[PDB]
Design a binder for this molecule. Sequence first.
Ligand SMILES: *[C@@H]1O[C@H](CO)[C@@H](O[C@H]2O[C@H](CO)[C@@H](O)[C@H](O)[C@H]2NC(C)=O)[C@H](O)[C@H]1NC(C)=O
Ligand SMILES: *[C@@H]1O[C@H](CO)[C@@H](O)[C@H](O)[C@H]1NC(C)=O
Ligand SMILES: *[C@@H]1O[C@H](CO)[C@@H](O)[C@H](O)[C@H]1NC(C)=O
Lengths: 442, 49, 49, 236, 98
Amino acid sequence: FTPTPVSYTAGFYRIPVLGLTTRMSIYSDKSIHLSFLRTVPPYSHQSSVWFEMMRVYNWNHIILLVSDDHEGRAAQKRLETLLEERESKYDNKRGPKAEKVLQFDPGTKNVTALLMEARELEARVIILSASEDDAATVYRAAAMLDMTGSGYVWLVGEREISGNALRYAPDGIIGLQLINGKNESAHISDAVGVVAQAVHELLEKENITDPPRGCVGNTNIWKTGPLFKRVLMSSKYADGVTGRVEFNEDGDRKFAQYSIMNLQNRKLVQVGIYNGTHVIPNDRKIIWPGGETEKPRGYQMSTRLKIVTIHQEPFVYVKPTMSDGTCKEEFTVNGDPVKKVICTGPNDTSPGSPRHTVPQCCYGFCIDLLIKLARTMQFTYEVHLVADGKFGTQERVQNSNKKEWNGMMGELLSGQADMIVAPLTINNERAQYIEFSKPFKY
Amino acid sequence: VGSLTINEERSEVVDFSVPFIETGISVMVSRSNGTVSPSAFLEPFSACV
Amino acid sequence: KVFASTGYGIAIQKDSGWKRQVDLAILQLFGDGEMEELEALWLTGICHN
Amino acid sequence: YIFSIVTTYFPGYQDFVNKIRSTIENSFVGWELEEVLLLDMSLDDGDSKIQNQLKKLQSPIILLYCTKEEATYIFEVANSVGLTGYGYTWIVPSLVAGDTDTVPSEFPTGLISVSYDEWDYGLPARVRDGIAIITTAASDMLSEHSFIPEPKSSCYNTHEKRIYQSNMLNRYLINVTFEGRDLSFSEDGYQMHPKLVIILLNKERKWERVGKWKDKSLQMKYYVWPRMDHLSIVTL
Amino acid sequence: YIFSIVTTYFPGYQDFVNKIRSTIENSFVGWELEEVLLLDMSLDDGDSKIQNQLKKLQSPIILLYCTKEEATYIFEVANSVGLTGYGYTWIVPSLVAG
Ligand SMILES: *[C@@H]1O[C@H](CO)[C@@H](O[C@H]2O[C@H](CO)[C@@H](O)[C@H](O)[C@H]2NC(C)=O)[C@H](O)[C@H]1NC(C)=O
Ligand SMILES: *[C@@H]1O[C@H](CO)[C@@H](O)[C@H](O)[C@H]1NC(C)=O
Ligand SMILES: *[C@@H]1O[C@H](CO)[C@@H](O)[C@H](O)[C@H]1NC(C)=O
């Protein structure tokens, strides 16, 4: 907050000021500060360069780890907002969408509960925007819990390519960097050129008649502060240390230029030159982590599944195991072998009572349908019953106007389950939350 | 629209909404004019009497 | 007790942007109890058995 | 019931509209929603080019969110579309209801808003309430911890020696209530159970009151809403 | 199927609307009709009432009867309400038609 104590003062009377070094996003809002005019694009915007990477790497599935504060808040806001393009009347190209955006807590020394529930997802790219304390635990976690395996693709912001992070930096990570970086001097010339271009335009109106000086007595917003600020932020020149220094819709340095660096296991090395859409890799070889060199497809479609199903006499019977860890065979009227699959039912004893997640081999009719499908589409599965014990409906919890899902439908839309096969109806209301097959018995 | 079935060869190119009226290969039968029992003349009394 | 469990439906061009909407709306039609009235208007007659 | 919403990029709007949506999908009542729009303060021709699609949206209820100036301008564009007849209302929050005695001729009638006025908030009584809050919170802190901090030696020079514990004041200071009336606060920095008022821009080009609100209860005064072809019927 | 009709004070209109009425009510087809309007271009505050009562009509087909200047005026207003896009096909006789 080293720039604040002056952003307020001349903010009173609304005297415009110019920002040089800091790059946090808080100072951008038009409601908390009427004073900043930013020469260095703040860390927020650098999200889009990743979206830009997506147009030449196609890893449409994607994981995000926003660290929870206003800093990361804006990062999530912006990245989420990027996807809203492609009205689709082109004609329906595959649109990259964010997967489970696992949020965070800044001051935390154990993240193990986050990575396995992350590693067991469907994607293979990691975009971590964070701070310097954060990369420490992030790396010291991922590099040891069997996370940095090959096929993993990483990205970070400008604040993770340095600090203690490098002193725990995993291989092949990728960073972002502006062409300038820090410069206590160069942008000064740029800014005074801005104010120059502003002055000789000020004569066009010059109805200000003063910016009120003196301490006491002149307690009135100078009636041309905002207008002169619009003027200043509307200053167009093209010759400083960077060309066409512009001011954004919110009034920030528009169209700066980046260049995608990279760590060579002990050495940062530039690869490309990022400029709006101008992002081209220079003379080098983009080496990817986990000991690999080909462009890795960020998707790994899984073959396992977890399927839940209900208890029902004509479709899915339930029988306890034997008395040693087995369960008993049986044949048909034609003596045909009927299948039986191991079933981890959490309901060894009835409701209104305890509940135990004992195995209890279960079979039926839809069981037969499932096994028929398995040999047809190269599957492998593990089955278990429903915790609650009813089809599943809508309701209102907290005895308030809330709305969610009970039963197996809820055990699925939780993200817990993965596929549902049982005698489940097909209504209208339950359609707007899920996709259904074709029908298989009227 | 109109009376149109659903199979694979048609599910290849065009796409199909969820069907509304059921259908399928069925049978048609006809009733029978009465079935007077063969052992009628010993029916209307129990074994006791 | 029928053989070829299929259903009449509606056919649209491949992967358009109306499959979803007509789907939701026709399931709505079932859920609100109207197709019974329609079948009563044309499909089934009076000669219930 | 609610219909289309228009706003213009002002800081603190996505929160608003997302609150609307998240509370309109989380209701057991037969709600609905129409085409939400988006505006721009940059230039003028596109405004009338898009602010009219909402008009064809037969939405008797429109929510706006801006400041008084672009508010006046968009209202002028509305009168340029007309929109002063019976049926079209507006519900706009306090951030446009300025000093509650200025009446630009642009504002059509019926323009309701929520405000929070001193007209029962009595400055002396509120001083009393505040002294109550602070002193009783210090009391509750004493009940927690049998010691109490000291005034800082300087507003600026104490910084070289500002070496003390970490104050968990808000962890309790948010939660204090006495004098019968409960004043549990919020963590994120505002009140809980705020007392609000509702104004209506009467055709008298003024506004004082219609009804009062408190603790999630609508104490009204107009059991049927007025007008600016409407019949009344009775049964047994 | 014919919907509302709008016009102004240009002479020779009563006979027009009387024709439309008499030939729409001596015909065994199920036509209809909606709010038949009348304007006053002679007032600038009428343009407000112009947009006002103009909004009150919703009609996939419209008839209008005036001369070229008033036509430009009314159409310039209507481009600001939305009577010109998809569907609202206008119909005018050959009086404008210079
Ligand atoms: C906030 O303060 C309230 C009291 O102001 C706490 O409430 C509980 O303890 C009080 C002690 O006398 C009781 O009077 C209240 O009845 C009791 N609450 C209920 C619902 O019974 C409350 O725990 C405090 N909470 C926090 C988070 O500080
Ligand atoms: C800042 O930019 C100027 C302009 O190119 C350059 O000469 C100077 O070396 C830069 N500052 C540093 C510390 O490199
Ligand atoms: C069945 O009985 C009806 C009674 O009138 C008679 O008309 C018909 O011919 C009979 N048919 C057969 C197959 O017995």
